[PDB]
């Protein structure tokens, strides 16, 4: 079973340069091509390109000037670079092996943006069945997970993706039905976890 | 320049149900050259067919191949629960550079289910920040197709709502919405009375809900 496993930096700087790695574990080397993916979020996949054994560098030309793609066969790894990369290349990028196209990475996603991280603020969107939930906004950069009860309550809750706001910073909303009986009995909290925050926020949510 | 096409963009049928999903070039293909791929949400493209019909390995006997020069399609004779996923369909091995198709997301086939709408106005903790952010929440509803609007004092707004939706939910089939309307304090209290009203096909008539900033 051939696998590979890729690697770099994520979180990147607006107009600085993009390096990932990726290694082929349990396969040959050599006769596969060698090829990079993006896939911007909510879009589909982007061919970015190829490269074999020797330097064979066939890349795309929507980016062919900012591409570099590099072989290492020591170590059976091949790294692609970008250069000059600004918030339209943020996507999850993939290596994979064009044979069609068998194995791929598992893929690692890539945010590019001048904002600076920072931690969310929970806010509690109170009842008035019923539903009730908790507003996690202004945090950057993904993601953050959000519990009910730490971890009692899981039915009927819906947590939603997340929006890029125009300040460049990231928010969502976790909402959960429940029946209306249990608001003066059952008490709802929502639990907040940002790890590039690294901070972790307990909002009570009761009713207004 | 060879640009690959899927039809239709989203794929509604019952688990049971026979799928025919379609790809159409720009130029002619060889049927060898065409390639197709299954995606799950968060995970990497699984490969299904290489070639025509070339059933990759590791690949169910439900998924099949057919086509030539621009029409092409995969089909599942019998679609399982894990089947649901986004297709797409790639050229390769004939002119760089070997571009994907659009994509065609199948989903899971409901009867019609009316959301149940809901509205949470800025909490006091938040306007003692400086902004306020209004709610709007469309729970358990099908199809997905579905609008909604805000209204500040019978006002049509636009250009300051943002919107979420979930993932088809694996226990009821169907999908959840939250719409976000953004206003600076000045502009929240400036007016009153502050509403929601979502269309949808489940809905006899648009479904609005309001609250009036003080009661």
């Known amino acids: 079973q051939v696998q590979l496993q890729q690697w770099g930096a994520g979180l990147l700087k607006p107009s600085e340069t993009l390096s990932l790695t990726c290694a082929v574990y349990?396969?040959?080397?050599?006769?596969?091509?060698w090829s990079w993916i993006r896939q911007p979020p909510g879009k589909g996949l982007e061919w970015i390109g190829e490269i074999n054994h020797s330097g064979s560098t066939n890349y795309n030309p929507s980016l062919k000037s900012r591409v570099t793609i590099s072989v290492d066969t020591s170590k059976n790894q091949f790294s692609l670079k970008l250069s000059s990369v600004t918030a339209a290349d943020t996507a999850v990028y993939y290596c994979?092996?064009?044979?069609?196209?068998?194995?791929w990475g598992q893929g690692t996603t890539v945010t590019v943006s001048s904002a600076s991280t920072k931690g969310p603020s929970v806010f509690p969107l109170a009842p008035s069945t019923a539903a009730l939930g908790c507003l996690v906004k202004d945090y950057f950069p993904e993601p953050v997970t959000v519990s009910w009860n730490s971890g009692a309550l899981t039915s009927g809750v819906h947590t939603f993706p997340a929006v890029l706001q125009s300040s460049g910073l990231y928010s969502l909303s976790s909402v959960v039905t429940v029946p209306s009986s249990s608001l003066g009995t059952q008490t709802y909290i929502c639990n907040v976890n940002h790890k590039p925050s690294n901070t972790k926020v307990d909002k009570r949510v009761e009713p207004k | 320049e060879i640009v690959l096409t899927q039809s239709p963009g989203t794929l509604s049928l019952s688990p049971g149900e026979r799928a025919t999903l379609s790809c159409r070039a720009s130029?002619?293909?060889?049927?060898?050259?065409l390639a197709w791929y299954q995606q799950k949400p968060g995970q990497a493209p699984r490969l299904l067919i290489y070639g025509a019909s070339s059933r990759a390995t590791g690949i169910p006997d439900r998924f099949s191949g057919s086509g030539s020069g621009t029409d092409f399609t995969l089909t599942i004779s019998r679609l399982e629960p894990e089947d649901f996923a986004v297709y797409y369909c790639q050229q390769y091995g004939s002119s760089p550079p070997y571009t994907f198709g659009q994509g065609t997301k199948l989903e899971i086939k409901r009867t019609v289910a009316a959301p149940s709408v809901f509205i949470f106005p800025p909490s006091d903790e938040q306007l003692k920040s400086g902004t306020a952010s209004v709610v709007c929440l469309l729970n358990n509803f099908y199809p997905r197709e579905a609008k909604v609007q805000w209204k500040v004092d019978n006002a049509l707004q636009s250009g300051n709502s943002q919107e979420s939706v979930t993932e088809q939910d694996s226990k009821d089939s169907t999908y959840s919405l939250s719409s976000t309307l953004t206003l600076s304090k000045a502009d929240y209290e400036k007016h009153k009375v502050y509403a929601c009203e979502v269309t949808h096909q489940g809905l006899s008539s648009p479904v609005t809900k309001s609250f009036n900033r003080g009661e």
């Open positions: 349990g396969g040959s080397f050599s006769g596969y091509y």
């Open positions: 994979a092996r064009g044979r069609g196209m068998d194995v």
């Open positions: 130029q002619s293909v060889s049927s060898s050259y």
